[PDB]
Amino acid sequence: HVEVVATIAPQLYIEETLIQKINHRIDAIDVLELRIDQIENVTVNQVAEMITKLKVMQDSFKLLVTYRTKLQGGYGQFTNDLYLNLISDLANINGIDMIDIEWQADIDIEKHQRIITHLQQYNKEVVISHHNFESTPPLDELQFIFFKMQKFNPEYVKLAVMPHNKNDVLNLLQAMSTFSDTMDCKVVGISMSKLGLISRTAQGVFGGALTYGCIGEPQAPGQIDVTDLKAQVTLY
Amino acid sequence: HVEVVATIAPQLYIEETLIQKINHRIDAIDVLELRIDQIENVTVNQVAEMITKLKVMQDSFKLLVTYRTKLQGGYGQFTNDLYLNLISDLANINGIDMIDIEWQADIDIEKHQRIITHLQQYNKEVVISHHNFESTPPLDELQFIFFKMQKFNPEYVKLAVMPHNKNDVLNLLQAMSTFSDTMDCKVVGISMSKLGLISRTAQGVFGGALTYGCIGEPQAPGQIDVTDLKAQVTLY
Ligand SMILES: *[C@H]1C=C(C(=O)O)C[C@@H](O)[C@@H]1O
Ligand SMILES: *[C@H]1C=C(C(=O)O)C[C@@H](O)[C@@H]1O
Ligand SMILES: [Cl-]
Ligand SMILES: [Cl-]
């Protein structure tokens, strides 16, 4: 039941060459993730334009739009206020199925619940996400983070962490697995880098709902092509 | 550094057709495991004859001979006395590189140390093995079993256990991983069945030294072809 996400990161012009590679991989892709943080001064209208090119394929996959802030390992240098206005305004593009919203311990909980409630009222599935690109907290802290993110009643919680050792990979898998056993909410757990690759291929074994791959070059530490990732998912 | 084992289980006649399939897979196979417990009243001289056919390939892989008792999930119904005489007598076949000897909590420790010391004096590498085909003990018990088997100073310790859930798979990986961090001894940890398949493909990720696959049909619960298993090992 694990769905394969293809992450793309184009500029305001989605190339015909990229549309072509998406189509060659159509049977591997359940979710197409349009990263937009790589577009300096991206607007909602530019996102709407790019989605017009993708929606022809809307029958073959769900569309997820993700603005990854620089603080959380992406390229987005929007202010928190401009970022949260972008997330809220993405509710109006009909073609979007899913929206990523970032979680960290210092957020305004009230504002986050307002935006999340708004996205869901506009029939958008919310992925609440947390990335640590430096380290992997101990097991009890990983479970704590999943627990705090699920309190917003999102469709998905996503935790991505950087292992320094084997135990860090096992702690991410164990946290995801325990969460998946106890909660209705869908869970996504990533151990990044080649060391954590087993979290991407065996995601379904440990109760996770999405696994992220690329079409060309790795879009995050440890990513492989979605054709190869679908083949991996199929093995487990 | 994880070595791929190809398990074969022939009758006194090793078929030319089997020798052919071994040769097609020569680049995937580091260790050829000749199971012999499927041969009722197998003798050391019959093993010696079969090894004559295999030793032409001795440059391309190590030869491991394994008598798996019925109590430990194999077909061998030799008495403990006849089984331990077979293990000791395998020391005299020059072509054998490795010998599997079974461990369980009720063994005569003195006799086991004598045989293990004899095999090693005859320049055989010892794999001390324990199989539980019904269940997976809790983490502290898994570590206990590895700890008791390593006290014999074997070349390898091998624990194969049957998971009932995700936590059982994670406990096998964690036990193997902790053992590999603290001991010089090589370690092999198998979670059997499709649920435990990640233990076979990601064995090297968690500090394990061997991973077992087949040439045709699965020879143990969860096994895949050694070509596909080598490809998996190569990914991690
Ligand atoms: C979340 C996680 C990713 C990953 O680790 O592969 C890729 C990124 O684009 C997603 O937003
Ligand atoms: C030990 C383990 C095996 C496995 O689980 O694949 C196969 C068996 O032949 C080995 O002795
Ligand atoms: Cl699809
Ligand atoms: Cl070889």
Short mmCIF file of C-alpha atoms and ligand atoms in Angstrom, two decimals:
data_model
loop_
_atom_site.label_atom_id
_atom_site.label_comp_id
_atom_site.label_asym_id
_atom_site.label_seq_id
_atom_site.Cartn_x
_atom_site.Cartn_y
_atom_site.Cartn_z
CA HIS A 1 0.00 0.00 0.00
CA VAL A 2 3.11 2.33 0.03
CA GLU A 3 2.78 5.01 -2.73
CA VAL A 4 5.88 6.07 -4.78
CA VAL A 5 6.48 9.86 -4.91
CA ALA A 6 8.48 11.34 -7.84
CA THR A 7 10.07 14.64 -6.74
CA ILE A 8 10.62 17.23 -9.50
CA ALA A 9 12.18 20.71 -9.03
CA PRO A 10 11.72 22.73 -12.29
CA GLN A 11 11.76 26.50 -13.05
CA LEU A 12 8.59 28.51 -14.00
CA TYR A 13 8.83 26.67 -17.40
CA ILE A 14 8.21 22.90 -16.93
CA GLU A 15 10.25 21.52 -19.91
CA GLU A 16 8.58 19.18 -22.48
CA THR A 17 11.72 16.98 -21.89
CA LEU A 18 10.68 16.65 -18.18
CA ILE A 19 6.99 15.97 -19.09
CA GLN A 20 8.38 13.19 -21.39
CA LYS A 21 10.46 11.51 -18.60
CA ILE A 22 7.41 11.68 -16.23
CA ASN A 23 5.35 9.87 -18.91
CA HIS A 24 8.01 7.10 -19.44
CA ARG A 25 7.79 6.49 -15.63
CA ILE A 26 3.96 6.86 -15.36
CA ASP A 27 3.43 3.29 -13.95
CA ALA A 28 6.01 3.85 -11.13
CA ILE A 29 4.52 7.23 -9.98
CA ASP A 30 1.57 7.33 -7.52
CA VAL A 31 2.35 10.92 -6.40
CA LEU A 32 4.18 13.66 -8.32
CA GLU A 33 5.87 16.08 -5.88
CA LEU A 34 6.35 19.55 -7.41
CA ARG A 35 9.02 21.17 -5.26
CA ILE A 36 8.74 24.97 -5.67
CA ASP A 37 11.26 26.42 -3.11
CA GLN A 38 14.01 26.38 -5.89
CA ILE A 39 11.96 29.16 -7.63
CA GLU A 40 13.03 32.50 -6.02
CA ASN A 41 9.87 34.68 -5.67
CA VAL A 42 7.62 31.77 -6.84
CA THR A 43 3.94 32.91 -6.73
CA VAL A 44 0.64 30.97 -6.49
CA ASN A 45 -0.12 32.07 -10.11
CA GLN A 46 3.24 30.59 -11.33
CA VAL A 47 2.36 27.31 -9.47
CA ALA A 48 -1.14 27.34 -11.08
CA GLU A 49 0.55 27.72 -14.56
CA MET A 50 2.94 24.75 -13.96
CA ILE A 51 0.04 22.58 -12.67
CA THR A 52 -1.89 23.33 -15.96
CA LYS A 53 0.91 21.38 -17.79
CA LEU A 54 0.77 18.45 -15.25
CA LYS A 55 -3.04 18.02 -14.81
CA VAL A 56 -3.32 16.09 -18.20
CA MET A 57 -1.60 13.28 -16.17
CA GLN A 58 -3.91 13.87 -13.10
CA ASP A 59 -5.63 10.46 -13.78
CA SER A 60 -2.25 8.60 -13.35
CA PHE A 61 -1.08 10.26 -10.05
CA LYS A 62 -1.88 12.71 -7.21
CA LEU A 63 -0.17 16.15 -7.27
CA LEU A 64 1.70 17.22 -4.08
CA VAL A 65 3.12 20.79 -3.89
CA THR A 66 6.01 21.30 -1.47
CA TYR A 67 7.77 24.56 -0.50
CA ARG A 68 10.82 23.32 1.47
CA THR A 69 12.30 26.16 3.59
CA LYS A 70 16.09 26.52 3.75
CA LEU A 71 15.94 25.96 7.55
CA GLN A 72 14.42 22.49 6.78
CA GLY A 73 17.01 21.56 4.08
CA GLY A 74 15.42 23.14 0.97
CA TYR A 75 16.13 26.36 -0.98
CA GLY A 76 13.18 28.53 0.22
CA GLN A 77 14.22 31.83 1.86
CA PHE A 78 10.68 33.30 2.14
CA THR A 79 9.91 34.81 5.56
CA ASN A 80 7.66 32.63 7.79
CA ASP A 81 4.75 35.10 7.02
CA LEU A 82 5.21 34.88 3.21
CA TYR A 83 5.67 31.07 3.43
CA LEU A 84 2.42 30.58 5.45
CA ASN A 85 0.50 32.87 3.01
CA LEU A 86 1.81 30.72 0.09
CA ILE A 87 0.70 27.50 1.88
CA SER A 88 -2.79 28.96 2.58
CA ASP A 89 -3.15 30.34 -1.03
CA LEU A 90 -2.25 26.95 -2.61
CA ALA A 91 -5.81 25.86 -1.42
CA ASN A 92 -7.25 27.65 -4.57
CA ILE A 93 -5.43 25.63 -7.32
CA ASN A 94 -7.99 22.90 -8.17
CA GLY A 95 -5.30 20.50 -9.54
CA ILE A 96 -3.40 20.23 -6.18
CA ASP A 97 -4.35 17.04 -4.21
CA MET A 98 -1.77 17.37 -1.37
CA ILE A 99 0.12 20.22 0.35
CA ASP A 100 3.24 19.91 2.54
CA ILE A 101 3.35 22.19 5.64
CA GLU A 102 6.43 22.25 7.85
CA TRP A 103 6.47 21.58 11.58
CA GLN A 104 9.14 22.66 14.12
CA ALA A 105 8.88 22.99 17.97
CA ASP A 106 8.70 26.89 17.82
CA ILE A 107 5.58 27.21 15.53
CA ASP A 108 2.46 29.30 16.35
CA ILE A 109 0.17 26.25 16.98
CA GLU A 110 -3.07 28.32 16.55
CA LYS A 111 -2.03 29.74 13.12
CA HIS A 112 -0.92 26.24 11.98
CA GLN A 113 -4.31 24.71 12.98
CA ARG A 114 -6.11 27.58 11.15
CA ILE A 115 -4.17 26.98 7.90
CA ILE A 116 -4.46 23.17 8.17
CA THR A 117 -8.22 23.43 8.86
CA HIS A 118 -8.49 25.79 5.77
CA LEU A 119 -6.56 23.41 3.45
CA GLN A 120 -8.79 20.49 4.54
CA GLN A 121 -11.98 22.62 4.11
CA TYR A 122 -10.71 23.21 0.51
CA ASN A 123 -10.44 19.37 0.08
CA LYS A 124 -6.59 19.33 0.20
CA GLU A 125 -4.76 16.48 1.92
CA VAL A 126 -2.14 17.87 4.33
CA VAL A 127 1.33 16.37 4.77
CA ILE A 128 2.82 17.88 7.98
CA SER A 129 6.60 17.44 7.68
CA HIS A 130 9.73 17.80 9.85
CA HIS A 131 13.30 17.48 8.50
CA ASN A 132 16.54 17.25 10.51
CA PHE A 133 19.43 17.12 7.96
CA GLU A 134 22.17 17.12 10.69
CA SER A 135 21.13 14.29 13.10
CA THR A 136 18.60 11.70 14.31
CA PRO A 137 17.12 12.29 17.78
CA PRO A 138 16.81 9.33 20.20
CA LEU A 139 13.77 7.01 19.74
CA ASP A 140 11.62 8.69 22.48
CA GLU A 141 12.21 12.11 20.81
CA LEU A 142 11.30 10.76 17.34
CA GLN A 143 8.02 9.36 18.78
CA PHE A 144 7.45 12.78 20.50
CA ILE A 145 7.83 14.63 17.14
CA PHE A 146 5.36 12.25 15.35
CA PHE A 147 2.98 12.68 18.36
CA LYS A 148 3.12 16.54 18.22
CA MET A 149 2.56 16.63 14.40
CA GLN A 150 -0.42 14.19 14.49
CA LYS A 151 -2.22 16.50 17.05
CA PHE A 152 -3.09 18.72 13.97
CA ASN A 153 -5.15 15.83 12.48
CA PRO A 154 -3.29 15.87 9.13
CA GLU A 155 -3.69 13.16 6.46
CA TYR A 156 0.07 12.36 6.73
CA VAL A 157 2.92 12.99 9.16
CA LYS A 158 6.41 12.91 7.64
CA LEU A 159 9.69 12.73 9.64
CA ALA A 160 13.02 12.85 7.70
CA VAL A 161 16.23 12.54 9.78
CA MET A 162 19.97 12.14 9.05
CA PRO A 163 21.58 9.04 10.55
CA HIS A 164 25.17 8.97 11.84
CA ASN A 165 25.12 5.19 12.53
CA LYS A 166 23.08 1.94 12.24
CA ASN A 167 21.17 2.62 15.52
CA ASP A 168 19.90 5.95 14.08
CA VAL A 169 18.42 4.06 11.06
CA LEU A 170 16.83 1.42 13.37
CA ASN A 171 15.42 4.17 15.67
CA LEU A 172 13.68 5.91 12.70
CA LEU A 173 12.21 2.55 11.51
CA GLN A 174 11.09 1.68 15.13
CA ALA A 175 9.46 5.10 15.66
CA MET A 176 7.57 4.83 12.32
CA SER A 177 6.59 1.22 13.06
CA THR A 178 5.26 1.98 16.63
CA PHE A 179 3.40 5.07 15.29
CA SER A 180 1.78 3.04 12.43
CA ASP A 181 0.56 0.39 14.98
CA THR A 182 -1.18 2.90 17.33
CA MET A 183 -2.52 5.76 15.07
CA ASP A 184 -5.06 6.02 12.13
CA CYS A 185 -3.04 8.94 10.62
CA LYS A 186 -0.68 7.92 7.70
CA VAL A 187 3.07 8.03 8.51
CA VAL A 188 6.18 8.65 6.41
CA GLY A 189 9.62 8.04 7.99
CA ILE A 190 12.87 8.77 6.08
CA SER A 191 16.43 8.04 7.20
CA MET A 192 18.37 10.12 4.63
CA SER A 193 21.75 9.37 2.89
CA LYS A 194 22.92 5.99 1.52
CA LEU A 195 23.08 4.67 5.15
CA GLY A 196 19.28 5.21 5.48
CA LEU A 197 18.30 3.91 1.96
CA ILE A 198 16.65 0.84 3.57
CA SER A 199 14.02 3.24 5.04
CA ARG A 200 13.03 4.21 1.42
CA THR A 201 12.93 0.66 -0.10
CA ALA A 202 11.36 -1.15 2.94
CA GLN A 203 9.08 1.84 3.92
CA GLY A 204 5.98 -0.39 3.50
CA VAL A 205 7.47 -3.17 5.68
CA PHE A 206 7.55 -0.71 8.67
CA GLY A 207 4.02 0.74 8.14
CA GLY A 208 4.97 3.85 6.11
CA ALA A 209 2.62 5.31 3.43
CA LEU A 210 4.95 7.27 0.97
CA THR A 211 8.48 6.71 -0.38
CA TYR A 212 10.26 9.45 -2.36
CA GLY A 213 12.45 9.00 -5.46
CA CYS A 214 13.73 11.08 -8.39
CA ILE A 215 13.41 11.12 -12.21
CA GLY A 216 17.07 12.22 -12.87
CA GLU A 217 19.61 13.30 -10.14
CA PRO A 218 18.90 12.77 -6.39
CA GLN A 219 16.53 15.57 -5.06
CA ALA A 220 17.35 14.62 -1.40
CA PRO A 221 20.23 12.64 0.24
CA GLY A 222 19.79 8.86 -0.55
CA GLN A 223 17.08 9.12 -3.34
CA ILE A 224 17.00 6.60 -6.33
CA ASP A 225 14.95 6.64 -9.64
CA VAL A 226 11.19 5.97 -9.09
CA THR A 227 11.27 3.01 -11.59
CA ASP A 228 13.96 1.36 -9.37
CA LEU A 229 12.08 2.51 -6.20
CA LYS A 230 8.77 0.97 -7.48
CA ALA A 231 10.69 -2.30 -8.21
CA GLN A 232 12.05 -2.21 -4.57
CA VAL A 233 8.57 -1.56 -3.07
CA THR A 234 7.27 -4.52 -5.19
CA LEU A 235 9.93 -6.89 -3.66
CA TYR A 236 8.79 -6.34 0.02
CA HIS B 1 31.77 -6.75 2.53
CA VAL B 2 28.63 -9.03 2.88
CA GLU B 3 29.20 -12.35 0.98
CA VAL B 4 26.31 -13.96 -1.01
CA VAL B 5 25.67 -17.66 -0.18
CA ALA B 6 23.95 -19.90 -2.79
CA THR B 7 22.22 -22.80 -1.00
CA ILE B 8 21.91 -26.04 -3.01
CA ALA B 9 20.26 -29.29 -1.79
CA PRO B 10 21.02 -32.10 -4.32
CA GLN B 11 21.00 -35.94 -4.05
CA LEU B 12 24.22 -38.08 -4.10
CA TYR B 13 24.34 -37.23 -7.88
CA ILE B 14 24.97 -33.46 -8.37
CA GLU B 15 23.25 -32.95 -11.80
CA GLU B 16 25.20 -31.37 -14.72
CA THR B 17 22.05 -29.14 -15.06
CA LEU B 18 22.72 -27.80 -11.49
CA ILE B 19 26.49 -27.34 -12.18
CA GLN B 20 25.37 -25.30 -15.26
CA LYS B 21 23.04 -22.97 -13.24
CA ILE B 22 25.85 -22.45 -10.63
CA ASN B 23 28.18 -21.40 -13.48
CA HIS B 24 25.62 -18.90 -14.99
CA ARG B 25 25.48 -17.30 -11.48
CA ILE B 26 29.25 -17.52 -10.74
CA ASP B 27 29.70 -13.70 -10.30
CA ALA B 28 26.84 -13.52 -7.70
CA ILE B 29 28.16 -16.46 -5.55
CA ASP B 30 30.85 -15.85 -2.87
CA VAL B 31 29.92 -19.02 -0.91
CA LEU B 32 28.25 -22.20 -2.20
CA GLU B 33 26.29 -23.90 0.62
CA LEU B 34 25.92 -27.66 0.04
CA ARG B 35 23.03 -28.68 2.26
CA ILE B 36 23.29 -32.45 2.92
CA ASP B 37 20.51 -33.19 5.51
CA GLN B 38 18.06 -33.93 2.56
CA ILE B 39 20.23 -37.06 1.85
CA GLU B 40 18.96 -39.85 4.17
CA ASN B 41 22.04 -41.82 5.40
CA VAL B 42 24.44 -39.30 3.73
CA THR B 43 28.06 -40.32 4.50
CA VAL B 44 31.35 -38.33 4.54
CA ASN B 45 32.45 -40.35 1.44
CA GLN B 46 29.25 -39.30 -0.46
CA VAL B 47 29.98 -35.63 0.54
CA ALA B 48 33.63 -36.04 -0.65
CA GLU B 49 32.28 -37.36 -4.06
CA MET B 50 29.89 -34.38 -4.51
CA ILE B 51 32.68 -31.90 -3.57
CA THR B 52 34.92 -33.48 -6.33
CA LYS B 53 32.34 -32.13 -8.88
CA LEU B 54 32.26 -28.62 -7.22
CA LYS B 55 36.02 -28.04 -6.54
CA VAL B 56 36.66 -27.09 -10.27
CA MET B 57 34.78 -23.86 -9.25
CA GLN B 58 36.77 -23.57 -5.92
CA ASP B 59 38.59 -20.44 -7.32
CA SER B 60 35.21 -18.58 -7.73
CA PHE B 61 33.70 -19.32 -4.24
CA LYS B 62 34.18 -20.90 -0.79
CA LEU B 63 32.44 -24.26 -0.09
CA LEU B 64 30.24 -24.46 3.07
CA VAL B 65 28.77 -27.87 4.07
CA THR B 66 25.64 -27.75 6.24
CA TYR B 67 23.75 -30.65 7.85
CA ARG B 68 20.54 -28.97 9.11
CA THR B 69 18.81 -31.16 11.76
CA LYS B 70 15.03 -31.51 11.63
CA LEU B 71 14.81 -29.95 15.14
CA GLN B 72 16.45 -26.80 13.62
CA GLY B 73 14.15 -26.66 10.53
CA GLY B 74 16.01 -29.00 8.13
CA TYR B 75 15.45 -32.63 7.05
CA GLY B 76 18.25 -34.36 9.08
CA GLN B 77 17.00 -37.11 11.43
CA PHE B 78 20.48 -38.41 12.44
CA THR B 79 20.88 -38.94 16.20
CA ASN B 80 22.93 -36.21 17.98
CA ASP B 81 25.87 -38.75 18.19
CA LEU B 82 25.79 -39.57 14.43
CA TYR B 83 25.37 -35.84 13.58
CA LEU B 84 28.41 -34.79 15.71
CA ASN B 85 30.52 -37.62 14.17
CA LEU B 86 29.55 -36.35 10.66
CA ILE B 87 30.51 -32.76 11.62
CA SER B 88 33.89 -33.92 13.04
CA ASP B 89 34.59 -36.22 9.98
CA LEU B 90 33.90 -33.39 7.47
CA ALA B 91 37.33 -31.97 8.67
CA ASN B 92 39.06 -34.52 6.28
CA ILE B 93 37.55 -33.33 2.92
CA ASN B 94 40.21 -30.90 1.63
CA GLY B 95 37.70 -28.99 -0.59
CA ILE B 96 35.49 -27.86 2.36
CA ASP B 97 36.28 -24.23 3.48
CA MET B 98 33.43 -23.83 6.04
CA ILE B 99 31.34 -26.14 8.27
CA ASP B 100 28.02 -25.30 9.98
CA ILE B 101 27.57 -26.66 13.55
CA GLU B 102 24.29 -26.18 15.38
CA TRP B 103 23.89 -24.53 18.77
CA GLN B 104 20.97 -24.92 21.22
CA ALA B 105 20.84 -24.21 25.03
CA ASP B 106 20.98 -28.00 25.95
CA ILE B 107 24.31 -28.88 24.15
CA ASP B 108 27.30 -30.63 25.80
CA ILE B 109 29.56 -27.50 25.82
CA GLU B 110 32.79 -29.56 26.28
CA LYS B 111 32.08 -31.87 23.27
CA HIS B 112 31.14 -28.81 21.13
CA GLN B 113 34.44 -27.02 22.01
CA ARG B 114 36.37 -30.26 21.21
CA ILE B 115 34.77 -30.58 17.75
CA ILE B 116 35.08 -26.83 17.01
CA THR B 117 38.75 -26.84 18.11
CA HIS B 118 39.30 -29.94 15.81
CA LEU B 119 37.63 -28.30 12.76
CA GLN B 120 39.79 -25.16 13.24
CA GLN B 121 42.98 -27.28 13.72
CA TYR B 122 42.05 -28.83 10.30
CA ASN B 123 41.88 -25.25 8.83
CA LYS B 124 38.05 -25.24 8.55
CA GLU B 125 36.09 -22.05 9.25
CA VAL B 126 33.22 -22.78 11.68
CA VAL B 127 29.74 -21.26 11.36
CA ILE B 128 27.93 -21.88 14.69
CA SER B 129 24.20 -21.58 13.91
CA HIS B 130 20.86 -21.39 15.77
CA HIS B 131 17.45 -21.50 14.04
CA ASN B 132 14.03 -20.79 15.58
CA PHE B 133 11.41 -21.38 12.82
CA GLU B 134 8.42 -20.68 15.16
CA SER B 135 9.25 -17.30 16.82
CA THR B 136 11.68 -14.45 17.54
CA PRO B 137 12.80 -14.06 21.16
CA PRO B 138 12.91 -10.56 22.72
CA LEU B 139 16.01 -8.40 21.96
CA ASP B 140 17.86 -9.26 25.25
CA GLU B 141 17.39 -13.01 24.50
CA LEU B 142 18.66 -12.62 20.91
CA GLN B 143 21.80 -10.85 22.24
CA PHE B 144 22.15 -13.68 24.86
CA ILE B 145 22.07 -16.36 22.10
CA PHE B 146 24.75 -14.52 19.99
CA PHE B 147 26.81 -14.09 23.23
CA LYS B 148 26.64 -17.85 24.11
CA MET B 149 27.56 -18.95 20.53
CA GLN B 150 30.55 -16.54 20.26
CA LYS B 151 32.06 -18.05 23.51
CA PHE B 152 33.20 -21.01 21.24
CA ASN B 153 35.44 -18.59 19.24
CA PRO B 154 33.92 -19.56 15.86
CA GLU B 155 34.62 -17.65 12.61
CA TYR B 156 30.86 -16.86 12.28
CA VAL B 157 27.78 -16.85 14.50
CA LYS B 158 24.46 -17.23 12.67
CA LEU B 159 21.00 -16.57 14.22
CA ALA B 160 17.88 -17.24 12.06
CA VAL B 161 14.48 -16.44 13.65
CA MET B 162 10.83 -16.30 12.47
CA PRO B 163 9.13 -12.93 12.92
CA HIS B 164 5.42 -12.56 13.78
CA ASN B 165 5.46 -8.74 13.44
CA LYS B 166 7.56 -5.66 12.49
CA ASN B 167 9.13 -5.41 16.00
CA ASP B 168 10.49 -8.99 15.65
CA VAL B 169 12.29 -7.95 12.40
CA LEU B 170 13.68 -4.77 14.06
CA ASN B 171 14.82 -6.78 17.14
CA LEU B 172 16.81 -9.23 14.92
CA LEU B 173 18.44 -6.29 13.04
CA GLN B 174 19.21 -4.47 16.38
CA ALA B 175 20.74 -7.60 17.96
CA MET B 176 22.95 -8.21 14.88
CA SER B 177 23.90 -4.52 14.72
CA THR B 178 24.86 -4.28 18.47
CA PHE B 179 26.80 -7.59 18.21
CA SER B 180 28.72 -6.38 15.08
CA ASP B 181 29.72 -3.13 16.94
CA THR B 182 31.18 -4.89 20.03
CA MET B 183 32.70 -8.23 18.77
CA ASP B 184 35.51 -9.23 16.27
CA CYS B 185 33.61 -12.48 15.40
CA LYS B 186 31.57 -12.31 12.10
CA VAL B 187 27.76 -12.25 12.54
CA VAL B 188 24.86 -13.45 10.38
CA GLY B 189 21.29 -12.49 11.39
CA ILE B 190 18.24 -13.75 9.44
CA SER B 191 14.59 -12.79 9.95
CA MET B 192 12.89 -15.52 7.86
CA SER B 193 9.71 -15.31 5.65
CA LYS B 194 8.73 -12.43 3.32
CA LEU B 195 8.23 -10.18 6.43
CA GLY B 196 11.97 -10.57 7.27
CA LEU B 197 13.31 -10.24 3.64
CA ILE B 198 14.84 -6.84 4.52
CA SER B 199 17.28 -8.72 6.84
CA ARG B 200 18.61 -10.61 3.73
CA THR B 201 18.90 -7.59 1.33
CA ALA B 202 20.19 -5.02 3.91
CA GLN B 203 22.32 -7.60 5.88
CA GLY B 204 25.47 -5.52 5.19
CA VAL B 205 23.82 -2.28 6.38
CA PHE B 206 23.40 -3.85 9.90
CA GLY B 207 26.95 -5.34 10.14
CA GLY B 208 26.16 -8.90 8.92
CA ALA B 209 28.74 -10.99 6.98
CA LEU B 210 26.65 -13.57 4.92
CA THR B 211 23.28 -13.43 3.12
CA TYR B 212 21.66 -16.63 1.78
CA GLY B 213 19.80 -17.06 -1.53
CA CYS B 214 18.79 -19.86 -3.91
CA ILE B 215 19.49 -20.92 -7.52
CA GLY B 216 15.89 -22.20 -8.22
CA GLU B 217 13.08 -22.54 -5.57
CA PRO B 218 13.42 -21.02 -2.05
CA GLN B 219 15.61 -23.33 0.22
CA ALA B 220 14.44 -21.44 3.39
CA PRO B 221 11.44 -19.14 4.14
CA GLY B 222 12.01 -15.70 2.41
CA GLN B 223 14.98 -16.67 0.08
CA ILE B 224 15.39 -15.04 -3.45
CA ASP B 225 17.76 -15.94 -6.41
CA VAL B 226 21.45 -15.09 -5.69
CA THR B 227 21.66 -12.91 -8.89
CA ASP B 228 18.79 -10.76 -7.47
CA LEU B 229 20.33 -10.99 -3.94
CA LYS B 230 23.77 -9.81 -5.24
CA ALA B 231 21.97 -6.88 -7.02
CA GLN B 232 20.26 -6.01 -3.63
CA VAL B 233 23.56 -6.19 -1.68
CA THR B 234 25.11 -3.89 -4.38
CA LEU B 235 22.34 -1.23 -3.81
CA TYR B 236 23.10 -0.76 -0.02
C1 LIG C 1 10.29 14.94 1.57
C2 LIG C 1 11.37 14.05 1.56
C3 LIG C 1 12.22 13.84 0.49
C4 LIG C 1 13.19 12.84 0.61
O1 LIG C 1 13.88 12.67 1.67
O2 LIG C 1 13.36 12.15 -0.41
C5 LIG C 1 12.20 14.57 -0.69
C6 LIG C 1 11.46 15.86 -0.45
O3 LIG C 1 11.23 16.49 -1.69
C7 LIG C 1 10.15 15.65 0.25
O4 LIG C 1 9.49 16.89 0.45
C1 LIG C 2 21.17 -20.87 7.02
C2 LIG C 2 20.11 -20.03 6.67
C3 LIG C 2 19.37 -20.12 5.50
C4 LIG C 2 18.41 -19.14 5.24
O1 LIG C 2 17.62 -18.70 6.15
O2 LIG C 2 18.35 -18.75 4.07
C5 LIG C 2 19.50 -21.14 4.56
C6 LIG C 2 20.19 -22.31 5.21
O3 LIG C 2 20.54 -23.24 4.22
C7 LIG C 2 21.43 -21.90 5.95
O4 LIG C 2 22.05 -23.03 6.55
CL CL C 3 0.45 5.92 -11.61
CL CL C 4 32.39 -15.57 -7.06
#
